[PDB]
């Protein structure tokens, strides 16, 4: 898809990612990484959540939406031309090979 997410050097980048919990309160583990989704987990991980809360975090990369309600959209603050590229958002729907892999294109200028 021709779908891009844009930002000028210095702005915050906003890459979207969503899921709908099977029941209220049942969170699904999610991970974010720089580069397209590999076999499992995230390539060059920047953030990770579990069935409770955020287990791995990195500065600049935050889940500022209601992640508890399935809004796992990412915020990359103060972007550089180095931040340009594909980003993986892996929604780890429980069970045998059920994962929702989202590749998101970020373009810095």
């Amino acid at each position, epitope marked *: 898809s021709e779908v891009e997410y844009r930002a000028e050097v210095g702005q915050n980048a906003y890459l979207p990612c969503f899921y709908t919990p099977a029941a209220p309160g049942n969170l699904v583990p999610v991970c974010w990484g720089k580069g397209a989704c590999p*076999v499992f987990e995230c390539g060059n991980v920047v953030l990770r959540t579990d069935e409770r809360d955020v287990n791995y975090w990195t500065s600049r990369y935050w889940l500022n939406g209601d992640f508890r309600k399935g809004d796992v959209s990412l915020t990359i603050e103060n972007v550089t031309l180095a931040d340009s590229g594909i980003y993986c958002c892996r929604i780890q729907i429980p069970g045998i090979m059920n994962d929702e892999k989202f590749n998101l294109k970020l373009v810095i200028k």
Partner: antibody
Amino acid sequence: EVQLVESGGGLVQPGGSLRLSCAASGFTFSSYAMSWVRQAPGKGLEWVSAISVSGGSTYYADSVKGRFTISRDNSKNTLYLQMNSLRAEDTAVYYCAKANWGFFDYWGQGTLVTVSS
Amino acid sequence: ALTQPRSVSGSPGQSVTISCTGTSSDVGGYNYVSWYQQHPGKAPKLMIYDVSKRPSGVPDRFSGSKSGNTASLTISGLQAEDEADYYCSSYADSVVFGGGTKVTVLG
């Protein structure tokens, strides 16, 4: 310092069952995906199955899908492989490895699983 | 899905290179290629991951590259030690391994 110790291999009758364990030390097991990679004697490497960091999502090779079940106990820093409905083709050295996002940096000295009548 | 030469041989000090041919969905449109070294009664050793990334403890003389669908491990200045089996791996959609390559140090 990083150590992985496979246990549970031996001789199983075809159609039988076997449970492999892997004791992890030297790293934060709780924050890495894990997998099992097998090697038939004098043959090459074949990925068997993997488990997410949380343990909630599992991934399998078509050859073992339905028969094998990977599980983790982050509290005991242990990885398990439950092998059911075994066949001669499954005769291999089963390595337990630290899968990251598809690559295996640390491996244990594997356990031999022999499936013969 | 991944094809490697059965054997590559070189004299000590030679630059030698193992190819790994996959599809545009394996090695092509992804940077997810690893390389493992395996000596006789030992478990494999991660030599290169993410096409070129080299783990700590792997000598500088092991370099990883990719062109199109053909990933290449190049062992610059061969040593006797380097006599091992080498497997390439792709981990974009699933974990696949090449057939392996027996590196023979001739001298």
